[PDB]
Assembly symmetry: C3
Homo-oligomer: 147 residues x 3
Amino acid sequence: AKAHVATLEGNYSDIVLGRVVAFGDTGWNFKEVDMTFIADDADADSKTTLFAGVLVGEDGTPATAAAGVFGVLVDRKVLPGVDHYIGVFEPGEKVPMVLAVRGLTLNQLKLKYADGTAIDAAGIQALEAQGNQVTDKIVGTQFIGSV
Amino acid sequence: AKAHVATLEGNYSDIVLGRVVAFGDTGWNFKEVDMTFIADDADADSKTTLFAGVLVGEDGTPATAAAGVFGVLVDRKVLPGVDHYIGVFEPGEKVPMVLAVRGLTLNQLKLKYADGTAIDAAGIQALEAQGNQVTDKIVGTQFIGSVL
Amino acid sequence: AKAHVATLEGNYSDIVLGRVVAFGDTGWNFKEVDMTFIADDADADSKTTLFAGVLVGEDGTPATAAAGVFGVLVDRKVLPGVDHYIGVFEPGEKVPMVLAVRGLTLNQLKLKYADGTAIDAAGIQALEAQGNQVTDKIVGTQFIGSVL
């Protein structure tokens, strides 16, 4: 008897808190690389397990350790509320993804490895090292019950 | 016989010669780290030994070598003439202080290790590798007793 | 049937496609280096072998491998269409040159090593360590005799 329900909370802004806007080149911050969108050996209807905030190395494989951390995936195809991207790609297909590399302020709490685990402290060094600011200073919000 | 005197030389903008104004995140250039303000072992009211321009690592320990250089202490509590913070703290307590990290131009001549010695030619790479321009072309100033 | 003919091809802004300008400094992207202009063997009246887009190390030696790339030489003395410095510097002299290091979007098709060889894929890593973008998405151009 379970009711069919859908949910949506959070936006792209919550991932990219801040950004340096280079006057001479608006694209100075982003590197575009190709990754496997639909998982391999899966049905055309198998929704991809790629989500905003997954760390990916410059090669394109999602990062499972501090070693492979190069950037943050912010592609417009994997933002919250993007649902109808089903079957438009074949298994094992490689399609371009956009990544943010340098000159950004990132939300510490939402960066996650390929498995979804939060970024290790040793991994934060890679992001901090190159361009970016990683900060967990977030206000949060209260909805109901919590006066 | 030792007439009490005080001196002021330099200020905040005399170290951070230039800054890249990040849009949206105005704190893109700075980090906050907890540091031991009053020495762990010292008199209850001994002034802290920290001075502006001292190199500091990621954990807040003053950098004694190029290996531990991460940033430059910039916080307002250590600027010249801010001695009114004496006695407030207690030995062994750690207090946050702002550090400068990236996107800045730094006056080399005022960067010194914890011991007060001048920055090393190897440690300069760490600061420059962070996205900063360490420079030496400073006009300087000359006072009475110099022919101009 | 021989006539004295001269030609000009390019510009300065096709190497540094974009640049981030800092409020504090308009010159924190670059670095000035001491470079040898005329080799120690070629007589005084001979053209220099450098060109805009040659990768150089910090010590001023033109880059020969991906492990030594530090910046791109974009000084205004070697821009295309100048050609008036022949014989002004005797062999072995050392002259300052303006390198471009940080905060740039750099063309790849014009970057080259010491001998003119194109930039290796593993040499892009060194140049992006300074925080720059190496982009190949250049429309190019096509002159008379071509369709479109």
